[PDB]
Amino acid sequence: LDEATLTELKTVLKSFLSKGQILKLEVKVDPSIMGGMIVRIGEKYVDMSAKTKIQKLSRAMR
């Protein structure tokens, strides 16, 4: 991605912790996630992706 959408996520990910610290990060590209991003601050895992096609089993689940 570009600079205007990454320097926010390198700063809005600092708004969570708030303990006098200097953050670090890794990036890995995966296309099987079709339309989102997953992130793991420690052991947190806020998932927003194309898993939400499998969550439409409830339409087929009576």
């Binding site: 927003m48 939400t52 096609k53 439409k56 339409r59």
Partner: protein, 70 residues
Amino acid sequence: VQKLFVDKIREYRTKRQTSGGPVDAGPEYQQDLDRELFKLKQMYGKADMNTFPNFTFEDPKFEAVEKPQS
């Protein structure tokens, strides 16, 4: 994911444009719905659409008892 909420309704409306049953059946849905239509009649029975019950019953014949008495 309300952007996915609109995108599974809008490709449900496309399924509501139907002419003859299946859209991509081919030899698949034509054979399977005919294989299953036999099995609801195969071990069940041979039955028409509107034919009433047509039969006739005969009761037990009342024989007599011969009896010289006194």
